[PDB]
Amino acid sequence: TYMKIADYGQLGEYTCDAKCDAEFGEPGNIRHLEGKTYDYRGVFCFNRKNLQ
Amino acid sequence: TYMKIADYGQLGEYTCDAKCDAEFGEPGNIRHLEGKTYDYRGVFCFNRKNLQ
Numbered sequence: 001t002y003m004k005i006a007d008y009g010q011l012g013e014y015t016c017d018a019k020c021d022a023e024f025g026e027p028g029n030i031r032h033l034e035g036k037t038y039d040y041r042g043v044f045c046f047n048r049k050n051l052q
Numbered sequence: 053t054y055m056k057i058a059d060y061g062q063l064g065e066y067t068c069d070a071k072c073d074a075e076f077g078e079p080g081n082i083r084h085l086e087g088k089t090y091d092y093r094g095v096f097c098f099n100r101k102n103l104q
Contacts, residue, residue: 047070047072049069
């Protein structure tokens with residue numbers, strides 16, 4: 001698994017220079033998603049004399 | 053007791069040189085049998101003066 005940072009939120013807003021506080025902004029998502037892995041295999045035979 | 057192995061089995065068969073296997077053979081017998089032993093004894097007497 002791994003992280004999938006989606007979109008940075010809008011944090012600042014350019015307020016007026018009188019208020020003694022900021023204003024809330026939109027958050028960001030991280031979307032911790034995963035993924036699997038597959039396998040590959042096979043076989044093959046032989047004789048012993050027919051190979052010597 | 054002692055061993056009495058009867059007869060060695062027939063193991064090999066001169067098979068064809070294509071099959072990836074042998075063929076089973078007859079077994080052998082061992083006949084763990086026993087035997088006892090007998091005893092032999094007797095007595096004979098004498099006088100004492102008549103022997104001096």
